[PDB]
Amino acid sequence: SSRKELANAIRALSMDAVQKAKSGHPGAPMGMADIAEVLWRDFLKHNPQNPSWADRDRFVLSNGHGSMLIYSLLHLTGYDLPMEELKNFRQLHSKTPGHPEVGYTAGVETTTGPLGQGIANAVGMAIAEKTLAAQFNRPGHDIVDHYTYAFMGDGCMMEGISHEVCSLAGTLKLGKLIAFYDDNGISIDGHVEGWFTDDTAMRFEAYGWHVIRDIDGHDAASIKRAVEEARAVTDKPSLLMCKTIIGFGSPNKAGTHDSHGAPLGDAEIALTREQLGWKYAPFEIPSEIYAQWDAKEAGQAKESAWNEKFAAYAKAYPQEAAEFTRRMKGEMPSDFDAKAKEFIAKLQANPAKIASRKASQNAIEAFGPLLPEFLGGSADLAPYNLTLWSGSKAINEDAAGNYIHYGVREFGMTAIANGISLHGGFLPYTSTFLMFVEYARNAVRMAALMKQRQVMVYTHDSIGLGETGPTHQPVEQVASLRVTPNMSTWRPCDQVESAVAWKYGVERQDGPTALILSQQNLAQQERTEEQLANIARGGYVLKDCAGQPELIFIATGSEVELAVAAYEKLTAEGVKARVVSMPSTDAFDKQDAAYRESVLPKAVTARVAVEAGIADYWYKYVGLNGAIVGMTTFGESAPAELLFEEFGFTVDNVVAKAKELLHHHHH
Amino acid sequence: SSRKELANAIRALSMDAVQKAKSGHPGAPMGMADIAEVLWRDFLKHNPQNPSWADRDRFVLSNGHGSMLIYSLLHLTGYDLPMEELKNFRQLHSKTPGHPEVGYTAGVETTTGPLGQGIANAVGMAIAEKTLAAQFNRPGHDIVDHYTYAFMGDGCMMEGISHEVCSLAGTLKLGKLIAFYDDNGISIDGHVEGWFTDDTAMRFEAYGWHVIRDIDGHDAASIKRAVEEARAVTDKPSLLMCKTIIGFGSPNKAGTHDSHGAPLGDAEIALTREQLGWKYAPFEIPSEIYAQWDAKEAGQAKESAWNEKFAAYAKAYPQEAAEFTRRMKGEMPSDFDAKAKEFIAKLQANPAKIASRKASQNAIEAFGPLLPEFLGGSADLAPYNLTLWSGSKAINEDAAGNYIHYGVREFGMTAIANGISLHGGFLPYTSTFLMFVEYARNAVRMAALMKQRQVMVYTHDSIGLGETGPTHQPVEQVASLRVTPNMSTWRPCDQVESAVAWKYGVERQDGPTALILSQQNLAQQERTEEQLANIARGGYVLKDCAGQPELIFIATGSEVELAVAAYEKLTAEGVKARVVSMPSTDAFDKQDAAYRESVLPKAVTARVAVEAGIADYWYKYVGLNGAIVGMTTFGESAPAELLFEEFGFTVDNVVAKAKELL
């Protein structure tokens, strides 16, 4: 078989799988098949029999709608993705969902589809490789050495996140990142010149990339020469400008928007087979074509050689090797749990009224020596988010460091960190003011969807930040996080809940954790040993009465102090009241029914929520017969103490609103 | 007097107001003061006595933390912003909040602070000027002719949204957009070379901008020559690369991150006065410096000249001039309410089972001839969002058109449309798949904060979109919109509710409206005249019983049919059941309490919400003793019919959950 025939196997499988599903995207797989054949057969270092090989190259499909391209590649090269699964493309519980999903499918590195985020993930994978190589490689022992290859299209280039992450990739001189741009002139509205006219090569040169122009994306020799050129440039990420024809092979739909996102149709597929000279029936591949596509023997040889290298490394550097293995597996140090509990107990015994952003920094300082896998950063807010600890070292200064200055790039930061978590070897944390979670919002969602461990440090969480005013004062952002599937969100009320939340976040293996942290100092609360242990249950009884409470206050973060003051006033008047601290609604909801009943008993309807955030959220825990002391508006520019008074976060107002339930549930 | 003395008045007012507040940002106002002095005194066309003059130039401070720069300029040039307000910078209910806010302060064009969005707004204002000029100017009568000037810094340049909107500005050849980049080498983390190394001039030339490099931002002659050159380039937006020193004037904090975001301190202010040669006490400005800065006399002359031009236009083009005035004031045509009601009544009388995305297109088609102020578009999804009507004309093809191909740029699109609404003259609508409201989320928030009218057309709203799978299937996005202050969100259940929602959106005067639209066909519900009129109240009784209900279903959008099916089953068993359709929770919540009680009586606790979105939202209406048939997870890639079954959107499950309450 010629290279074109081998590439046409991808075209056939893609158009036929889309046709059988009556759904999906034939255009990009057909347009990029020749590029994929050269990259995967001539360059990609991988082992289909072990998709988790630590030193494999990473491939990312940023134009993720072209999912049949990667399913064809994985199937043809010998991964555990049988033809039956391709026949079940886009069907319930198949290993071939409409967009590729990490975990669903052997060999898929990331979940893509939302445009722009795949190239961001690839930038994170390349940062991870560079940093891990710098931390672990030793003279004569280069155990980390692999490339990151990405495909992307016009949509990814138009998205702002491409600017964020490719600018930063240029700064960091990511010489093992090689991206292929599917320059096919077509997007969904039609010919892109009506809305997309950038000199993209010049733009990427402005970022410090090595750009290869005018590659014939349907000519294997041209593509191969370009990839060799990119691999020879070791000090810059490379962009290959690949001129392709969307839907290549279809006489009537190639080069048209009609090939982008719908089945070609059976008549058109017959004509496409005739144009391509592809004789085989749908889902039929001859043994000779598998023989040229299969990567099991080469892959075995390469991983075997790497294992020999790693064994030599382990003999010369046994502690480093043990750390590499631990970190690539995502395992925690064996003594971490005990040391973290010792830290938390020390805080509970030694009160300090500090901002929870400072309590967060103190937890980073405490955990940092125990977690060399941290790869942390802030989006140009290190002095405000308090993300640096004494052991931080920026990777633009020393590549073996552990800290990233992300610049003013919140979305790019968060999707890069998704790439860092997907790579293995690190535990990323990211940070910005909470308001600007809105800039990064879909990357946060994607971390949750992909079940990735990442700690998101979001500071300056309410009107408590004061004079900066309503553009920066969060109101509804925490509610948005709380209703996100698989998101964990903590709003700690003091330095002890802050440390507990950080411990929870770094030990959470199957999804991300957002910390909602104050600008201003928070009072430490008294806790018994039992209460201290109950912080991690998300919601717990902090103050109580004998018998059934007449009133339960539910409070979070900076408002627990206010709720406790109201509880004290009411208790002194002879009212039976309880205070529940709710640092994490998601962790509380995961507790069993008996525990939740013990904290929020169904008999007690007179519930008062107190939080400087949007009020409507709290109907979930207060019901229709309680009260909510919350925000219902945007904030205002003024000193924070005047804002808390103006918006009702006062002991007198909280007590008055509570007493209306002693007056209403009565009358 | 001397231009440096005149610029130093901005420096003094800025450092002193920050010091008095013990809060704020002296650095960028001190760094950009010489640029501002040249722009405002020599070029900017404006009238302090009427900040709403239709043909004024628009100025945007995208690096909005530098708010004392714009307050100093407004005060010095004679706007209604007295010295007492500058002395009340960042104080409760002052006219000088920490970031500039449109409406709070005479002369402020937009609310900035979130980096990158000011330049986006300015691109929108320049698109509005270009389009309005093409629509209204006539030979001998150029009634629209003004510039859009923007200041921006490193943070705006790093943000992705700058790439989206400046790319599109190049495509649209916005020759009256002129941006000044405060190239001062400093951001909050320190010297920017550790994280920001772009050849920014080369980047902007890649967008098709005219770029002027190596301007000395502290030399009036350098700056003035650059502005003249940019104004002579009429077929490209221009970027002026202005080298400045942050905190210019401060001997110990100039050129450092220490001048970015905190008071300089009293000692350092004294040293700064010495270095600048500024001899005036805090909040002292001599009469001659006001005389040199004041723009009232020239401004009134220019606006009067324009009024005379407009009067001549109105004599030659009376209908066009009346349209111009109406649109610039943001008024609706006087017969729009009646014509839209006639359309809605027609739909109710002529049932159709269509997707609410199609019903949306049909409302655009009906309203299009009535609302020439539409300036609509989609982020590369016209064939899916259905944003084109028969009279759509793309502005990249015809500058006098009414449609924008925004490309794959959801955040930039939304903030550009905020600029369009701020400009006056237009009613923007934007569109993408609902999932990607998450890419644009803070610009949506900013439309609400700024009380701007924009209709946001979000289609493909649930697991009903099918095989595309969980990256695209919305679950929690509608709940996020619903709890945003001043946002209106509509999830119509058929073509009639879709038209009512569109009417509500275009008739809003003080905020945005999000339409949550289905991929798939939705059955039309039968309605009495009273029900039909009550759609606009956001929640209404769609199916009822005699007497107090025993069970109330609350449903939205594509799930109303499912709730009606469950109602029919329970009604046939003899249950006193009701179905409430809730297309807009915010419109419902604004109703009088007797109305809300008539729909959701407080004595009836057996309430079942049905919506293919996140369940947690609905506790607001069902409380603790009801049921919610909603989503609690991400979606899955499969045909939509199978997903609705898999996730419990079945008559059997809805009926079972209801019977658990009875």
Ligand SMILES: Cc1ncc(C[n+]2csc(CCOP(=O)(O)OP(=O)(O)O)c2C)c(N)n1
């Ligand atoms: C952030 C985001 N916005 C919108 C979409 C919907 N969408 C999918 S592909 C596409 C444009 C297709 O353009 P391109 O990447 O050039 O596709 P191709 O040439 O591969 O078909 C759009 C708008 C998306 N997937 N992600």
Ligand SMILES: Cc1ncc(C[n+]2csc(CCOP(=O)(O)OP(=O)(O)O)c2C)c(N)n1
């Ligand atoms: C989207 C967004 N992210 C973060 C911030 C916080 N912030 C305010 S100013 C700034 C950096 C200031 O850098 P630059 O624009 O270069 O400021 P300057 O030189 O004018 O002081 C940051 C990160 C913000 N306002 N908006």
Ligand SMILES: [Ca+2]
């Ligand atoms: Ca394309």
Ligand SMILES: [Ca+2]
């Ligand atoms: Ca700067």
